[PDB]
Design a protein around this ligand. Structure first.
Ligand SMILES: Nc1nc2c(ncn2[C@@H]2O[C@H](COP(=O)(O)OP(=O)(O)O)[C@@H](O)[C@H]2O)c(=O)[nH]1
Ligand SMILES: O=c1cc(O)c2ccccc2o1
Ligand SMILES: O=c1cc(O)c2ccccc2o1
Lengths: 301, 297
């Protein structure tokens, strides 16, 4: 069994990990890293590391980088043993922006399959945060096998138009969960089409920057509808058909049959780049009832 | 009247080890987490927590010494204290000998547990892995040394992630194999005074582990444990041996006694041998044998 560790670093990443835990993401070890002990006391993560205590990131990515570097041997000892490490953060602050590349580089040095899952900040958060996020993403990309970047701006095209600010950030938490769980559930709770760790590692190793799409549907033709929503997701930036590497997971209950799964795969193949490498896997989750959830990770544009 | 056993994890590696013990449900001991870094704190659900941080051995040593009164108060009343800085290194390497010294001056049977890193990890100057081991040895009654390199000889071809996971698991057993023998009823129970007799002032100890299922599982697991690469072919010369067999409540006396007879044959003729068993019905039909060997011929 592959050992998967999910790191949330900075306030946004720790909030995302708390949401993952609250929604019952299974089969992974949760690690919260932050510069604020009180926030960490309230987190339900398995492992909690308070860093940068001497300095305390004032949203300063350089302080976040130095706090993580100062703690690097400690982080390494926590990550040792993982086959796969997710590094999750909201980019644009100090602790996550500056610290996430340190965590990922430790995981990549150890040879764990290292997947970043991060948000770009909303435009309304201001240009300094956008610039910081841009620099942090560039740094993180060099240290991850795959770095999934979720543009928060595109979340506002989805969901409800009467959303509040707090609502918007909870949707960000949820999409970071979706990005992690859409991959890890393939490994931890496979359905009819088993895509195991070595397959995931084959397509995500050295893949570079990636985008994600998500779709959910119920009822008649649910699998086709969920796949069409996913591949047209605003989070994929109208770029699905340019991607040459695609990992797709289809989750449902035991009532989800191979015919439905296959028609979803056919729809996605028809839409994909002519030379795309596409891996399809399924997830058994009886808590979904009659919902089907499709997650697409797209890389190699 | 019952043995009071306190398990101290110091520094990031040691606190993480204690957290793993707690997560795995190690019973019958008090867990103590001591943080030695000013810059970072690994949180813990240990019973007792002390942050002395006010990544180097001298820093951790002075941090612990500065807090010696507080550490002593935490350890007072223990009959047995385990101290470990766990995997890796940092300030915990410097703090651990200070904790051990305080425990021993209180009169507790003081058992250190230290890992030698894998050779592929490289080495940080001053010879500080070996210097950390030497410092802890001078402050402990017994120092259990786990040579991680020997894990690459145990079982298929070990992967890097496997190697690290195995290291974590055997470190946990450096504590649990002994503490369960003392704290947890089995068919064959031991006297703490005999444990203290064999481990007081013993110095370096090595550990062996084995497991087996099916018929003859007790003998098979014991043979594996006494031949374990982690014992460095030292079993035949050992003058103090502790052996614990963990297994289901249905394990028979004859089968258990076969394992006890094997370790007696394998140890030095003049060895002290403490033998017992632990009921762990969650192992199913598997048995797990731990051997601790100290002294030379
Ligand atoms: N998913 C999520 N993102 C957040 C939350 N709060 C803020 N963010 C985003 O994360 C970015 C970094 O903020 P934060 O993680 O608090 O800063 P840090 O602790 O200094 O890394 C912000 O610019 C927001 O886009 C949250 O509760 N959840
Ligand atoms: O969760 C905590 C809180 C602390 O005060 C602490 C102190 C020392 C060591 C570990 C610790 O973990
Ligand atoms: O975690 C483990 C797994 C085993 O292989 C084992 C075997 C013998 C003794 C203790 C043991 O602890």
């Amino acid at each position: 069994l592959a050992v998967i560790k999910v790191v949330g670093i900075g306030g946004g990443g720790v909030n995302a990990v708390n949401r993952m835990i609250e929604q019952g993401l299974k089969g992974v070890e949760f690690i919260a890293i932050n510069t604020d002990a009180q926030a960490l006391l309230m987190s339900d993560a398995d492992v909690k590391l308070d860093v940068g205590r001497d300095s305390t990131a004032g949203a300063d990515p350089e302080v976040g980088r130095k706090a993580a570097e100062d703690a690097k041997d400690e982080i390494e000892e926590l990550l040792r043993g993982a086959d796969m490490v997710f590094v999750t953060a909201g980019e644009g602050g100090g602790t996550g922006t500056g610290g996430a590349p340190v965590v990922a580089s430790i995981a990549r040095k150890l040879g764990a399959l290292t997947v970043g899952v991060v948000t770009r900040p909303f435009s309304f958060e201001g240009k300094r945060r956008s610039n910081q996020a841009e620099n942090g993403i560039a740094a993180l990309r060099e240290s991850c096998d795959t770095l999934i970047v979720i543009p928060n701006d595109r979340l506002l095209q989805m969901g409800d138009a009467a959303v509040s600010l707090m609502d918007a950030f909870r949707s960000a938490d949820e999409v970071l969960l979706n990005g992690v769980q859409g991959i890890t559930d393939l490994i931890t709770t496979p359905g009819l089409i088993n895509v195991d760790f070595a397959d995931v590692k084959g397509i995500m190793s050295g893949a570079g920057t990636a985008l994600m799409g998500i779709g959910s549907a119920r009822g008649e033709g649910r699998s086709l509808k969920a796949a069409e929503i996913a591949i047209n997701s605003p989070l994929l930036e109208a770029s699905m058909e340019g991607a040459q590497g695609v990992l797709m997971s289809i989750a449902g209950g035991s009532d989800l049959g191979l015919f439905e799964i296959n028609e979803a795969a056919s729809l996605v193949q028809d839409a994909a780049h002519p030379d795309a490498n596409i891996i399809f896997g399924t997830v058994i989750d009886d808590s979904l009832g009659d919902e089907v959830r499709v997650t697409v990770i797209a890389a190699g544009f």
